[PDB]
Design a protein around this ligand. Structure first.
Ligand SMILES: N[C@@H](CCCC[NH3+])C(=O)O
Ligand SMILES: N[C@@H](CCCC[NH3+])C(=O)O
Lengths: 501, 501
């Protein structure tokens, strides 16, 4: 803290002496990338004293070869430029040379004015006549993220990570590029991007515990959305035909290294599509995105970090399909009992979970037990992108009954390395069944399933106005970034992730 | 209503009789717009019996001239097509003609197969051979939104508005087009789009009361954001140079025709800009968007609805500037007392609010009093887009002190027709002052100012790492759409606005 208090003392001295104190505006002549572009191929030793330029960035290096010569590195917009400050060139009307430069520290934001060219040793340089302190750094910075107190500083103080660590800047640029690619894919198909409410008197459309809030003037409990699905289907009733939404969902659950209370999701709804159409689209969209980002469909992934084992993920299309129940039964060496939601089958699934050392869910609903079995026996087969298809109705209250398989729905999930990326189905559009599945959901919630949702009467009424046959789909954008950028925890792909206090 | 009950009984009859019941997949040959493009110019009476096509849409009309000849209109993706169903073309493998058509009602989503062409009277038609009920409508629909019970039905059941009313569909395509324009403008300048948290252990960056929630596992209270500003500025400390975010902010306040609990806002931050640069950018961005949508810079506005008076809004640049204090003082006929936040000026502004019958704020802070006076004397002058500039520091805790004007800041608001559209300033980047102004905001909060924010220690520490000279800017997208679309309430430009009950 001595360095910080000393810096406040310096700045007070600068202000009281009438020297530059946080200048409002510094007019650069060009960006540092442009400067490297215009001068990065001059002859060694070239200097143009007929051109005075102004540059600015953050100081990353200060070296004094002598009391008369000082070398700076400044960094801005991914470009480093060296500043050579020779006392012979200094503008005395800005102060004596030693005074001007004694106010500068590594980490400061500074401006320089001078002549362009390259040093005799060949370094792109500005031969400076002056230096302005634009915004001082009051703390001693490390030279790299290795010198941070610990690597959680990167998440709690993300500006330090971005300032010092090119890899972190790269991730969030890639994140923006990937989302651009996705919007363009759907815009070219004639989709309409929409926004639906994040605050509602009800929640639904996913299996998640919601955040609860309160509107004081309405005196009403509200929920933050867990998914936009039910609103988006109303827009298809309304005739908009192809809609998508990219935004935050909120889940009130565990904050570990791979779960964040808010996450970025996309959904789209396409009238007259079924889940087979959506499989084809998923493959085209995601393989095209991987090809765009990586230049091939085979990309590395390091589950235990960059010095650990590497798995090469192959996105070559088409992808493997695993049928939900059949693959469980192949793993068990026994068939599930029918109906899948009978007490007989619930008891059987409990027994199978205990036999295979699968953690039991609470409460022990057929749907939650089926999910545990799928997690053990099927998700574990999904190394390369793989579709798990035809989920039981009992775990898929909004998915339409399978046109051929009793008790199943026209649903798929996309898994990569055993992690869920997409969830999609032929949409249930028959209001009697929809109401019945909502009632079974509400019973699960009353029995202690914090992930079951209440009945939504406004959605049932919308279905009574005629939802066309429709296919809908969701994508977890954060998990997708994790694979594309090869990061093994979600805190790497979210600028300001939640952290335990 | 007997209609809904009867329709449910019809569908149960259909299901039990093995007749088509919510088909999973209907494969259209082409969209109705594509159909009109291909066949819209054939001769009257043309029919191509060598081509069989499948079309689908929602039934908007059923008419007939005998038991043998039925006429439908179907509507889909903004295009109407007439279907001519002659018993002599009926495919009996789908049932008897009279039975197949007895199942169809106005409002149903239906499919047809048949031959393309035009009736002798010149109507684009499909000469059908079959009809499929895809998703029935269980309610009797009006033919236009005028037949709705009330016009709050348009907002509470938006699918009915979208289904019946072309003007509502136009609004939301316009909204998408405008947001697309804004992204492209900033993408071309090299900006990076980012996402920052909507859930925080603190709130800040705007004047608004927040929604409060709770994270159960972390056992900690959270706030929904009122603005992303404090996170976005950390990204500039981090070196990202040019960032923007387009997302929801949340305000826990009154719900009415112009106030929604959530609204769509944009912010951007640009290193090395000042508020003068931001005024020029606002003019360029907004006038170019107006030009893109309207074809000129002079656009109509109907503050009392479409048959009422029409105002012309003139976006020709440069726009009028009003200086905050000077214009208040011109309206008063006398000067405010200095310092503006002295008890003397607080007493004086209370007296002025009383004399001019201005509703007093609570509490009676200098900032809220200054805001009441500016709303009365200055915002009312802002018909055409106009900048109110140089706000007092006492109401601008995050804006940098004005380089020429004591007590003022380098801030502007953009007003159109007396309503705020933008808020922007040269960013305060001096940490001592920033802490002082945060404490002042905390004191307002403790005195009952539900719109003042608590001190953010994480942000103060971020400024201690050096925020470059920076300009930041926010835009209320909903208000913008209201003007661009000539709508006089916010419920018209939000798909699912919050409503009473
Ligand atoms: N709402 C789903 C995504 C879309 C499912 C198909 N309608 C989810 O959160 O997983
Ligand atoms: N946070 C401001 C917009 C940005 C102002 C300039 N930093 C608002 O909500 O009005």
């Amino acid at each position: 803290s001595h360095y910080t208090d000393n810096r406040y003392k310096m700045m007070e001295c600068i202000k009281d002496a009438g020297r530059p104190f946080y200048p409002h505006k510094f007019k650069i002549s060009m960006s540092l990338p442009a400067y490297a572009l215009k001068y990065g191929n001059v002859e060694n030793g070239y200097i143009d004293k007929d051109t005075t330029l102004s540059l600015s960035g953050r100081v990353t290096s200060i070296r004094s070869s002598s009391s008369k010569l000082i070398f700076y590195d400044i960094f801005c917009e991914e470009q480093k430029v060296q500043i050579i400050a020779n006392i012979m060139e200094h503008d005395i009307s800005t102060g004596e040379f030693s005074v001007s430069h004694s106010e500068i520290r590594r980490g400061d934001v500074v401006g320089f004015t001078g002549f362009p060219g390259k040093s005799k040793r060949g370094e792109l340089s500005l031969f400076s006549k002056s230096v302005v302190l634009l915004s001082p750094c009051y703390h001693m910075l490390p030279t790299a993220i290795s010198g941070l107190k610990d690597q959680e500083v990167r998440y709690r103080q993300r500006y330090l990570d971005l300032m010092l660590n090119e890899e972190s800047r790269k991730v969030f640029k890639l994140r923006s590029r990937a989302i651009k690619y996705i919007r363009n894919y759907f815009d070219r198909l004639g989709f309409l991007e929409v926004e639906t409410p994040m605050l509602n008197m009800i929640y639904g459309g996913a299996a998640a515990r919601p955040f609860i809030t309160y509107h004081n003037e309405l005196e009403t409990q509200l929920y933050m959305r867990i998914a936009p699905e039910l609103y988006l289907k109303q827009l298809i009733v309304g005739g908009l035909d192809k809609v998508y939404e990219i935004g935050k969902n909120f889940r009130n659950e565990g904050i570990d290294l791979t779960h964040n209370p808010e996450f970025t999701a996309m959904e789209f709804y396409m009238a007259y599509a079924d889940y087979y159409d959506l499989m084809d689209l998923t493959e085209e969209l995601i393989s095209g995105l991987v090809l765009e980002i990586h230049g091939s469909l085979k990309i590395p992934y390091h589950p235990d970090g960059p010095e650990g084992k590497c798995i090469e993920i192959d996105f070559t299309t088409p992808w493997k399909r695993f049928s939900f129940v059949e693959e469980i039964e192949s793993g068990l060496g026994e068939k599930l009992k029918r109906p899948l939601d009978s007490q007989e089958n619930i008891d059987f699934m409990v027994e199978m979970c205990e036999k295979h050392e699968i953690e039991l869910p609470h409460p022990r609903t057929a749907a939650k037990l089926l999910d545990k079995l799928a997690g053990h026996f099927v998700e574990t087969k999904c190394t390369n992108p793989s579709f798990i298809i035809d989920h039981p109705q009992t775990m898929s209250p909004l998915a339409k009954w399978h046109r051929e398989k009793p008790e199943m729905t026209e649903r798929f999930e996309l898994f990569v390395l055993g992690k869920e990326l997409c969830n999609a189905y032929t949409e249930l559009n028959e209001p009697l069944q929809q109401r019945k599945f909502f009632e079974q959901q509400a019973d699960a919630k009353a029995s202690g399933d914090v992930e079951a949702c209440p009945i939504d009467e406004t959605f049932c009424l919308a279905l009574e106005h005629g939802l066309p046959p429709t296919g809908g789909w969701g994508l977890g954008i954060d998990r997708l970034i994790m694979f594309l950028a090869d990061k093994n925890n979600i805190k790497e792909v979210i600028l300001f992730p939640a952290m335990r206090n």
